[PDB]
Amino acid sequence: NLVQFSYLIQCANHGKRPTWHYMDYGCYCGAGGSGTPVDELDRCCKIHDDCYDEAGKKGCFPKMSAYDYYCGENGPYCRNIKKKCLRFVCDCDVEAAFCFAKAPYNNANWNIDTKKRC
Amino acid sequence: NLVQFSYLIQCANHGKRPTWHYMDYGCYCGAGGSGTPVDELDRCCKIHDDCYDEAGKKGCFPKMSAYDYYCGENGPYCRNIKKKCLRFVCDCDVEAAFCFAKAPYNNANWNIDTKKRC
């Protein structure tokens, strides 16, 4: 679920920005998304949206499902194996959390005019 | 001293970027400095350099002197009163640590071509 995704993000970035900083960025980091992704970070979010759409079409409820994970000193990882829907959702979130942590955060792309730019 | 300035910075930013990220940024964040400061963060560093130059001309050894400070939940602050050189140095560092924490960090301005741009 989204509570868990926030935990993964913070695990991956070592607590270096709040999760809410990723909730209204570019064309895709946030609820919607269409248009060309504005930078590497926005491309992470586009992948994540496509991952959640796939999960919902699989009957996995990515926003409702509580999955098993661990936050190591390596960063986070998924722990489900037998519960396949749980694993698929957790993999979307882990990949995005590492993507977010590696991508540069461009302040000019926080809270943009999505109508004019997307 | 610089060990203490690093503690203030991390206090002020809640551990959100490493101190070393402020050691080669723009024209002024780092050892030297001349030219027009490239952004708000670079202007913080220019002020800090001017503050250290003043302290050295006062006989305060800003890089050698260990001052008294506290890191609160409010962020950091200086504790010297009677030891005036200690207080002056600590004030340079505290002001810069809050300035750094408030300024936007523009990745395009990390490790620039100072010869071409300063």
From Swiss-Prot, chains A, B:
CDD domains, sorted: PLA2c (cd00125)
A GO CC term assigned to this protein in UniProt: extracellular region
Cofactor, how bound (note): Binds 1 Ca(2+) ion.
PROSITE patterns named in the record: PA2_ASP (PS00119), PA2_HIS (PS00118)
Active-site residues from the entry: 48, 93
Biological process according to GO: arachidonate secretion; lipid catabolic process; phospholipid metabolic process
Tissue specificity: Expressed by the venom gland.
Main location: secreted
Cofactor(s) essential for the protein: Ca(2+)
Origin: domain of life: Eukaryota
Catalysed reactions, as listed in the record: a 1,2-diacyl-sn-glycero-3-phosphocholine + H2O = a 1-acyl-sn-glycero-3-phosphocholine + a fatty acid + H(+)
UniProt KW keywords: Calcium, Disulfide bond, Hydrolase, Lipid degradation, Lipid metabolism, Metal-binding, Myotoxin, Neurotoxin, Presynaptic neurotoxin, Secreted, Toxin
Pfam family, one: Phospholip_A2_1
Subcellular location: Secreted
GO molecular function: calcium ion binding; calcium-dependent phospholipase A2 activity; phospholipid binding; toxin activity
Known partners and oligomeric status: Monomer.
Summary of the function given for this chain in its UniProt record: Snake venom phospholipase A2 (PLA2) that inhibits neuromuscular transmission by blocking acetylcholine release from the nerve termini. Is directly toxic to skeletal muscle upon local application in vivo (dystrophic effect). Also has direct nephrotoxicity in experimental mice; a single subcutaneous dose (1.38 ug/kg) produces renal tubular and glomerular damage within 24 hours. PLA2 catalyzes the calcium-dependent hydrolysis of the 2-acyl groups in 3-sn-phosphoglycerides.
Other information: Activity and lethal neurotoxicity are lost upon modification with p-bromophenacyl bromide.
Protein name, entry field: Basic phospholipase A2 notexin
Provenance organism: Notechis scutatus scutatus (Mainland tiger snake)
